[PDB]
Enzyme design. Structure first.
Site, PDB file in Angstrom:
ATOM      1  N   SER A 277      -0.619  15.550 -12.101  1.00 17.01           N
ATOM      2  CA  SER A 277      -0.877  15.180 -13.483  1.00 17.01           C
ATOM      3  C   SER A 277      -1.121  16.438 -14.313  1.00 17.01           C
ATOM      4  CB  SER A 277      -2.081  14.238 -13.548  1.00 17.01           C
ATOM      5  OG  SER A 277      -2.501  13.981 -14.879  1.00 17.01           O
TER       6      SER A 277
ATOM      7  N   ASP B 286       0.826  -1.201   0.000  1.00 16.47           N
ATOM      8  CA  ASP B 286       0.000   0.000   0.000  1.00 16.47           C
ATOM      9  C   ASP B 286       0.864   1.256   0.000  1.00 16.47           C
ATOM     10  OD1 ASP B 286      -1.926   1.906   0.319  1.00 16.47           O
ATOM     11  OD2 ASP B 286      -2.428   1.398   2.409  1.00 16.47           O
TER      12      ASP B 286
END
Length: 330
Positions: free
Chosen positions: A199, A35
């Site tokens: 992004s 994770d």
């Protein structure tokens, strides 16, 4: 040193991925959920409340000659999905894919929430976010990666998650045969303890690319792709009959649909998520309403590039002095 381990979807939907991890001496192998959005290595154990164990493999520290109680240490964690666990702490030898760390904090669960009990395939979590998020008190502990880092050939790990198929976590090296083209690196902020990056935009299907900054986290422990409501609405508007369902808890779409791809930007590069990766199947057995793999982050407070996004790429988690993230197509 290096390590290399195969990671395997837990079910037919790729709801999560499990990776075998050796703990203790002799080894006890547990299948952990790696994770990159958290920083605790915790396991089901011989200390876990018996009624909260249902099929998981447990770690028994009393059977490990290298286990030592970390005196006075406790831990307690709550995840973004509302699940939680807590307990006490041992140090022990932990190996992943041939890479060994001695003295790793292994957090033994005394209690786990129902979602963990109900998932027989996940024996615990191995956190790979920054150690500043580790919950052990009163002495915070380091992640497996942080402990291994100085010994690694290069201070990196990579995630290569499969679509409906196994994939690979590598530690200490970049497998140049595992991706196509080049890897595009992008800046990381560690201010919130995550692999947080920005992004450069998105496209829906064959549509034009929208240049827009989307801050979010690379999180292998989250199943879906959670993005701003504007972006998510633009995606689902291209699927006839798709709608946001308050009763179901997100966007659903007719199971008869063909889903468009979704592209996200990494600098000037582009990662394309095929439409099929966005299908999470019937909302309930036999239903013709299917659950979407792109959902709104509104009310999460952060955008999450979870498995839906990451499995479309070869992803480098670069833990150099100034960390960065790399993405390649594959």
């Amino acid at each position: 040193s290096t390590g290399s381990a195969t990671t395997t979807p837990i079910d037919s939907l790729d709801d999560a991925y499990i990776t075998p991890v050796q703990i203790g001496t002799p080894a006890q192998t547990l299948n952990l959920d790696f994770d990159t959005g958290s920083s605790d290595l915790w396991v089901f154990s011989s200390e876990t409340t018996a009624s909260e164990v249902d099929g998981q493999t447990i770690y028994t520290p009393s059977k490990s000659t290298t286990a030592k109680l970390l005196s006075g240490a406790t831990w307690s964690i709550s995840y973004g999905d509302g699940s939680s666990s807590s307990g006490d702490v041992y140090t022990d030898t932990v190996s992943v894919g041939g890479l060994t760390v001695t003295g790793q904090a292994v957090e033994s669960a005394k209690k786990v929430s129902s979602s963990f009990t109900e998932d027989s395939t996940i024996d615990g979590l191995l956190g790979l976010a920054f150690s500043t998020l580790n919950t052990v008190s009163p002495t915070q502990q380091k992640t497996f990666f942080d402990n291994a880092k100085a010994s690694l050939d290069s201070p990196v790990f990579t995630a290569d998650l499969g679509y409906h198929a196994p994939g690979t976590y590598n530690f200490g090296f970049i497998d140049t045969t595992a991706y196509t083209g080049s890897i595009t690196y992008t800046a990381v902020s560690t201010k919130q303890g995550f692999w947080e990056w920005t992004s450069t935009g998105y496209a829906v299907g064959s549509g034009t690319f929208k240049s827009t900054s989307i801050d979010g986290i690379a999180d292998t422990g989250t199943t879906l792709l959670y993005l701003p409501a504007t972006v998510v609405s633009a995606y689902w508007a291209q699927v006839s009959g798709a709608k946001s369902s308050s009763s179901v808890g997100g966007y659903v779409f007719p199971c008869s649909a063909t889903l468009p791809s979704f592209t996200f930007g990494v600098g000037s590069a582009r990662i394309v998520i095929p439409g099929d990766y966005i299908d999470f199947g019937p909302i309930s057995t036999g239903s013709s309403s299917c659950f979407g793999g792109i959902q709104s982050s509104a009310g999460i407070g952060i955008n999450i590039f979870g498995d839906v996004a990451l499995k479309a790429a070869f992803v480098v988690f670069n833990g150099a002095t100034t960390p960065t993230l790399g993405f390649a197509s594959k």
